[PDB]
Paper text:
To obtain a nucleotide-bound structure, we incubated the purified protein sfLptB2FGC with the non-hydrolysable ATP analogue AMP-PNP. Unlike the sfLptB2FGC LPS-bound structure, LptC is moved away from the lateral gate TM1G/TM5F so that the TM helix became invisible in the complex structure despite of the high resolution of 3.5 Å showing near atomic details in the cavity of the transporter. In our structures, the sfLptB2FG and sfLptB2FGC process an open cavity to accommodate LPS, while the sfLptB2FGC AMP-PNP-bound structure adopts a closed central cavity with a closed dimeric conformation of LptB. The sfLptB2FGC AMP-PNP-bound structure shows a closed dimeric conformation of LptB with clear densities for two bound AMP-PNP molecules in the ATP-binding sites at the interface of the NBDs (LptB dimer). Several residues are involved in the AMP-PNP binding site, including Y13, T44, T43, Q85, K42, E163, H195 and N38 from one LptB of the NBDs and E142, L138 and S139 from another LptB of the NBDs. In addition to the residues of LptB2, we also found that two arginine residues LptF_R292 and LptG_R301 on the cytoplasmic loop 2 of LptF and LptG extended ~9.8 and ~9.1 Å, respectively, toward the NBDs to interact with the bound AMP-PNP molecules. Interestingly these mutations showed no impact on the ATPase activity of the complex but caused cell death in the functional assays, suggesting that LptF R292 and LptG R301 residues are essential for LPS transporting but not ATP hydrolysing function of the transporter. No densities of LPS in this closed cavity was observed, suggesting a post-exporting state of LPS. Two lateral gates TM1F/TM5G and TM1G/TM5F shift into a closed conformation with their respective TM1 and TM5 helices oriented parallel to each other in close proximity, a ‘cis’ conformation. In this structure, a detergent molecule (DDM) is trapped at the lateral gate TM1F/TM5G, with hydrophobic tails trapped in the cavity while its hydrophilic head extends into the periplasm.
Author numbering:
A (entry chain B): 2 to 240
B (entry chain F): 2 to 133, 249 to 352
C (entry chain G): 1 to 140, 249 to 262, 269 to 358
D (entry chain A): 2 to 239
Write the structure that this text describes.
């Protein structure tokens, strides 16, 4: 297992963009963290993985205290991370984008390092872009490599930040199938997208977070029929 | 396969910062020629040689500078595009782009060593023969009082190794804010090196101080600066 | 279109922190090989760490005038390189701001810089360089002075001031030949061969101001207008390069 | 006023990423251009506005031929453009991001240049970010400035490329209201987003484009009940 974050806080210019957030996620279930372009569901993702130093928080991988470990030390304990700000290597190929994170995980030989990259490019349908470039990719095609590169590290506790940011209507129901086939193999992710019809139909819980605070938490069939959620999120009259 | 990518982005920007820096500093040595052709009352037969043989005195100061100013240009390019935050968050630590900034530091320290003992003296046996004391090759045979060489011929190679190491932690300045202007503390430190270490041989050489005791307590204090600033995660 | 607007303050402040960083890198590095040579042969007691190093510090206004065209060309491309890479220069052109107006916003912030290079290249640089020969020889020209060399001296009879009377015009055509290869798409050409292309095509124009300069001994052209031909022949083909 | 593009084509490595595309848009109606991450609904947007040179195309603003004009010359004839690849000025403020494109349009004095930027920051709800920075913005908040900056040029024929790419569920129905209040004032845009429930409920026509070709065109109540559209787009049972 259980990654746990307790009482995080962050303030930039004395603004306090994050307030008493507290989210816990087990291994084997996927959890939403939703809200408007206020709350800081990325600054919470920054303080868990460890890019910005927290101010009052406490991060625990089920018995430990990793709250003062650097960024790379948490990535080897199991925390994976998919950023929002369009991060591919841009001059390696797509085959080398997947292979550059498979030169880690010292349990794969030269055999199963080669048929993992050739299998990850089948379940994402990017096999016709086998060696194009990083720069000459296109929007959702750039997004389908960054997800495939993040699942190639074999982590636990993935923190997927905007996976479906302008992908497809088809490749989302193809990503959602292979984010549940990894859920059954003991891996619990934290999806935080904005189209709340693909993210709420795959999650088991949710944490609707407004300007700095939790305002709701529960089942996905509960989050829609809360009226304070429909005021600051969800639009109006949503199914 | 990611050390090969960190190499070919610095080595493609080290060459393009070496030639551009050589053409700027040789056009200056080409326009003083016009100040030494008409009013100097000498002909123009020697400038064609003197351009190509004026190089290895010049390409021994900028050959360290074409390294660490090529690392800042291509690590800062890899931080604003968030290419290293995915390198950390998939495994490998900060001790891989130290390991990658020391593979091609060997590639420069080889060329900067050929320049300092096989073309340094070769220039002054062709600058003193056409267009007219301490320019031998090996000095472990004599015991002369000019021990500036073998402590200045040598530490133009440790300068390549050390300045490549002190600029790995000076590049990480770009998460989501701040300036790209990080070339100033690296360049202001490279001035302080060559105002002391290459000039501790003419006021502290030639029979004033020992240029083996003082030409390494400047060089090793300036190397432990490149380690305690790189190891800033388990300080206390 | 307004005189000194907001976008002119944005390109005029982006490259200005890159002009002053390429200038510091070139003036300091030329201050090392003048420090090494003026201390390699010391000989006398007045030549040591101070006094023969103070000669270098009193010679940096001479090393600004000769290194400003090569630092203001170099920093204007490293400054516009970070704008076109992050795609915040295509949105200027897609909102009416023409690429000639991007070129004009560099002239509003580099032509007042070479007038500062000119103002210290004739008032404090010949004063300090001559003063540097007195703390180095105690016991061991100009531009306004060339107006006194117009006739009273007895390719050269006038052509030394008039290639330095318009250095602001000659620096500016080096900029417009540089920032004509910056523009383009962002997918294929990966911004490496757009700056090195721009430095090279702006360096060929810098050698053709002292090679085409002393070439009046062919017909007998006036040297005052004959030293303007290299700048104006490329200023025409530059204003076509960013018009298409 | 009808912007027209006829028989465009583009090939990079002999791949032909765009084939015989032909889209026309009037003034006063908004038109979709949808498809998977194949077709090149951005390379078509590149060839209309003019970033990449076309290979066989022909672009007409209702009687003219602007097919060999540069990028900035078409922006003054009326073509506006919102890019996909996250393009803010990153060190000006948000108030200066809107003001830097209002120093053009030589019909606004110093009065109505000041109450347009203070009004565009009300209909987008970014008034509390009045001077933060460009760099220190956040995802959809960065996207709401790039849309507000593109509507500040007062163009015709806007080519909005992914307007709703990760914004909100609320700020999309607030953008959709002020993209229809500009539709009534004679301005026809070309939306090409991917959530086909907000883009198809605001458009009047659509051009479903697959790998290089048009495969469908018609009413939004038609595009859903075409079965070749539901095979390569739309998911299934939508
Ligand atoms: C400060 C001093 C100036 C710094 C200049 C920065 C220039 C960096 C540009 C990097 C240029 C890359 O150019 C490469 O030059 C190579 C030289 O071999 C070509 O090969 C490659 O095709 C081409 O990509
Ligand atoms: N370095 C910073 N300085 C100042 N303000 C900042 C900084 N980083 C973030 N903010 C502000 O913090 C708030 C939340 O940022 P962020 O964590 O990115 O939220 P967000 O969830 O990512 N927005 P979105 O991704 O659309 O949900 C916004 O109002 C930002 O403007
Ligand atoms: N410079 C280029 N070199 C090679 N291939 C390219 C280049 N630019 C684009 N492509 C390819 O052209 C195809 C379409 O590109 P693009 O026009 O961006 O489509 P797209 O619509 O933007 N994808 P999306 O935005 O998600 O709908 C993709 O397969 C790209 O890989």
């Amino acid at each position: 297992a259980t990654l746990t974050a307790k009482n995080l806080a962050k303030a930039y210019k004395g603004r306090r963009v994050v307030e008493d957030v507290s989210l816990t996620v087990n291994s084997g279930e996927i959890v939403g963290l939703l809200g408007p372009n206020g709350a800081g569901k990325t600054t919470t993702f920054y303080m868990v993985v460890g890019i910005v130093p927290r101010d009052a928080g406490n991060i625990i991988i089920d018995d430990d205290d990793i709250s003062l470990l650097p960024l790379h030390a948490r990535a080897r304990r199991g925390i994976g991370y998919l950023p929002q700000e369009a991060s591919i290597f841009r001059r390696l190929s797509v085959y080398d984008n997947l292979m550059a994170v498979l030169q880690i995980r010292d349990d794969l030989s030269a055999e199963q390092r080669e048929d993992r990259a050739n299998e990850l490019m089948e379940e994402f349908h990017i096999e016709h872009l086998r060696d194009s470039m990083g720069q000459s990719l296109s929007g959702g095609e750039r997004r389908r490599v960054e997800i495939a590169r993040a699942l190639a590290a074999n982590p636990k506790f993935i923190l997927l930040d905007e996976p479906f940011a302008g992908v497809d209507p088809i490749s989302v129901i193809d990503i959602k199938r292979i984010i549940e086939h990894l859920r059954d193999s003991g891996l619990g992710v934290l999806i935080t997208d904005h189209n709340v019809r693909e993210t709420l139909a795959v999650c088991e819980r949710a944490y609707i977070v407004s300007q700095g605070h939790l305002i709701a938490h529960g089942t996905p069939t509960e989050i829609l029929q809360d009226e304070h959620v429909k005021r600051v999120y969800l639009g109006e009259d949503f199914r | 396969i990611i050390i090969r990518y960190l190499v070919r982005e610095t080595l493609k920007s080290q060459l393009a910062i070496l030639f551009i820096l050589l053409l700027i500093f040789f056009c200056q040595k080409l326009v003083r020629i016009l100040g030494a052709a008409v009013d100097g009352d000498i002909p123009a037969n020697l400038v064609l040689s003197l351009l190509g043989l004026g190089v290895p005195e010049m390409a021994q100061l900028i050959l360290p500078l074409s390294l660490f100013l090529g690392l800042l240009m291509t690590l800062g390019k890899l931080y604003t595009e968030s290419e290293i935050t995915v390198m950390h968050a998939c495994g490998l630590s900060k001790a891989v782009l130290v390991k990658a900034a020391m593979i091609l530091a060997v590639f420069t320290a080889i060329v900067a060593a050929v320049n300092v003992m096989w073309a340094g003296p070769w220039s002054s046996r062709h600058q003193d023969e056409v267009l007219e004391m301490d320019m031998r090759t090996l000095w472990n045979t004599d015991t002369d009082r000019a021990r500036a060489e073998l402590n200045w011929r040598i530490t133009l190679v440790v300068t390549v190794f050390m300045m490549a190491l002190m600029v790995v932690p000076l590049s990480v300045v770009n998460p989501r804010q701040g300036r790209v202007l990080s070339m100033l503390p690296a360049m202001l430190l490279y001035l302080l090196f060559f105002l002391i270490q290459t000039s501790l041989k003419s006021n502290g050489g030639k029979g004033k101080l020992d240029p083996t005791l003082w030409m390494w307590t400047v060089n090793l204090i300036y190397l432990a600066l490149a380690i305690v600033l790189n190891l800033w995660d388990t300080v206390f | 279109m307004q005189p000194f607007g907001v976008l002119d303050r944005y390109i005029g402040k982006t490259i200005f922190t890159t002009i002053m960083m390429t200038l510091f890198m070139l003036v300091s590095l030329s201050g090392i090989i003048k420090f090494v040579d003026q201390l390699k042969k010391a000989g006398q007691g007045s030549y040591d760490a101070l006094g023969a190093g103070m000669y270098t510090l009193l010679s940096v206004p001479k090393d600004v005038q000769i290194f400003f065209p090569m630092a203001a060309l170099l920093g204007a491309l490293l400054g516009l390189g970070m704008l076109a890479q992050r795609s915040e220069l295509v949105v200027m052109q897609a909102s009416g701001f023409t690429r000639m107006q991007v070129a004009l916003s560099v002239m509003k912030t580099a032509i007042p810089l070479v007038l500062l290079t000119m103002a210290i290249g004739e008032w404090v640089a010949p004063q300090g360089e001559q003063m540097a020969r007195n703390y180095r020889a105690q016991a061991m020209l100009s531009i306004s002075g060339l107006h006194n060399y117009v006739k009273y001296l007895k390719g050269r009879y006038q052509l030394n001031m008039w290639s330095k009377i318009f250095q602001p015009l000659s620096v500016a055509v080096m900029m417009l030949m540089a920032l004509s290869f910056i523009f383009g798409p962002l997918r294929s050409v990966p911004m490496g061969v757009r700056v090195v292309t721009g430095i090279s095509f702006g360096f060929v124009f810098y050698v053709l101001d002292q090679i085409f300069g002393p070439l009046t001994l062919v017909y007998g052209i006036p040297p005052i207008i004959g030293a303007l031909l290299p700048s104006a022949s490329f200023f025409l083909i530059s204003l076509w390069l960013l018009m298409r």
